[PDB]
């Protein structure tokens, strides 16, 4: 939100360079559990996490795909086992 | 305009593939359609 | 007198051109090293540096001073900030 | 930073002692081969640190570079030292410590850095059984 707040001023490129690396680890988190079924979290900055195997819990980002990653990762994670 | 949808595009094309192959995996292998 | 004048006009008032916020920059005007011929010229010269100081103060005051949230056109606003932005380059 | 490098050393002393004590000929057949296969990974660590020696003699190392160079072996030695502590702690023996090694090999399935370690260990430790 701080980006769109100063999207036209002289702090647009500096904050662009800041945001470009502050989203680097989380995308790397996503590209494990989707493509390898290996669940990567660091400090609890990743909300999604994984008896008939469907009693597991749940706990800007587009909320239309947030619920979809939870099944898209657990499927690949079950094909690993 | 700043948006993260441009990076949603090389990821969201694969989620649907994963989920649709998952749905196919039930019918043609574990016979949900027979049940 | 040479550098001190440039200092006063540049946005750095000394103790020769005494900065007030009720009379801007004004020369001392009571000493025997300024005469009535010189007096008009000094008064004419003080005003431009007064304008410069107020302009720079306005620009620093109103650009890059909030994290965005408030609705106001005299104290805030992207267009007011854009005015400061054009004003410095002029 | 020297204190930050010390956990790999405690995960090296505890590692080597286990490799001698559990090679003795009065424990189970699986435990002997388990320790004798952990010997292989310790030899691999030795071969890594000596190329680090030739690099230090050419004046081409520093402490932040050293901490960076030993991180992939730090993770392997961490998993191995935790397993060593677990195997001695429960008085483990027989084939129930071939289920522990089967479980460790099953745990990682996609990483292939850490999967290969526990799978290799289950490979060498299941040969007498």
Indicate the SS3 state at residue C1: coil
This PDB structure is determined at a resolution in Å of 9.0
DSSP for D3-72 reads HHHHHHHHHHHHHHHHHHHTTSTTS-HHHHHHHHHHHHHHHHHHHHHHHHHHHHHTT---HHHHHHHTHH
What is the distance in angstroms between the Cα of C49 and the nearest Cα belonging to chain A?
Answer: 26
DSSP for C13-76 reads --SSEEE-SSS-EEE--SSTT--HHHHHHHHHHHHHHHHHHHHHHHHHHHSS--S-----SSS-
Q: What angle do CA D111, A66, B32 make, to 5 degrees?
A: 80
Question: Among residues D116, D123, D118, which one has the least CA distance to residue D105?
Answer: D118
- Decide: D104 and D42 in contact? Cβ < 8 Å: no
What is the distance in angstroms between the Cα of B15 and the nearest Cα belonging to chain A?
Answer: 6
Structure tokens at C61: 């005051």
Name the CA dihedral angle for D65, D66, D69, D75, rounded to a multiple of 10 degrees. Answer: -130
Q: Is D101 exposed, middle or buried (0-12, 13-18, 19+ CB in 10 A)?
A: buried
**Count of C-beta atoms within a 10 Å radius of residue D27:** 17
- Decide: D34 and D97 in contact? Cβ < 8 Å: yes
Identify how the structure was determined: cryo-EM
Answer whether A9 sits within 8 Å of C67, measured CB to CB.
no
Chain A hits for D115, Cβ within 8 Å: none
Report CA-CA distances (Å) from A78 to A47, C11, C67.
20, 70, 45
Structure tokens at D36: 């004798």
CB of A14 within 8 Å of a chain C CB? The answer is no
Strand partners, C18: C26
> CA nearest D103 in A: which residue?
A81
Task: Please state the separation of Cα C88 from the chain's center in Å.
Answer: 13
């Amino acid at each position: 939100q701080e980006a769109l707040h100063n999207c036209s001023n002289e702090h647009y490129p500096v904050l662009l360079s800041l945001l470009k690396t502050s989203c680097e680890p989380y995308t790397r988190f996503i590209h494990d559990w989707v493509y390898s079924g290996v669940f990567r979290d660091a400090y609890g900055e990743f909300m999604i996490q994984v008896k008939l195997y469907w009693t597991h819990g749940y706990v800007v980002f587009l909320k239309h795909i947030a619920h979809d990653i939870y099944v898209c990762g657990k499927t690949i994670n079950l094909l690993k086992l | 305009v700043l948006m993260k949808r441009s990076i949603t595009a090389p990821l969201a094309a694969h989620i649907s593939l994963v989920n649709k192959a998952a749905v196919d995996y039930f019918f043609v292998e574990l016979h949900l359609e027979a049940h | 007198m040479i550098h001190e004048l440039l200092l006063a006009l540049s946005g750095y008032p000394g103790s020769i051109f005494t900065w007030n916020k009720r009379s801007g920059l004004q020369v001392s005007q009571d000493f025997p090293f300024l005469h009535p011929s010189e007096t008009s010229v000094l008064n004419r010269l003080c005003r431009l540096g007064t304008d410069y100081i107020r302009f720079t103060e306005f620009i620093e005051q109103y650009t890059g001073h909030v994290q965005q949230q408030q609705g106001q056109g005299g104290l805030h606003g992207i267009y007011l900030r854009a005015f400061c932005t054009g004003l410095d380059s002029v | 930073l020297v204190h930050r490098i010390l956990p790999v050393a405690a995960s090296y002393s505890a590692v080597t002692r286990f490799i001698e004590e559990k090679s003795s000929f009065e424990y189970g057949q699986v435990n002997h081969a388990l320790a004798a296969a952990m010997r292989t990974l310790v030899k691999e660590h030795l071969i890594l640190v000596s190329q680090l020696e030739q690099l230090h003699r050419q004046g081409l190392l520093s402490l932040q570079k050293l901490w960076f160079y030993i991180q992939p072996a730090m993770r392997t030695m961490d998993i191995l030292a935790s397993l060593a502590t677990s195997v001695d702690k429960g008085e483990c023996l027989g084939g129930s410590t071939l289920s522990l090694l089967h479980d460790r090999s099953f745990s990682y399935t996609g990483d292939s850095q850490a999967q290969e370690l526990c799978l290799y260990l289950t490979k060498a430790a299941s040969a007498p059984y």
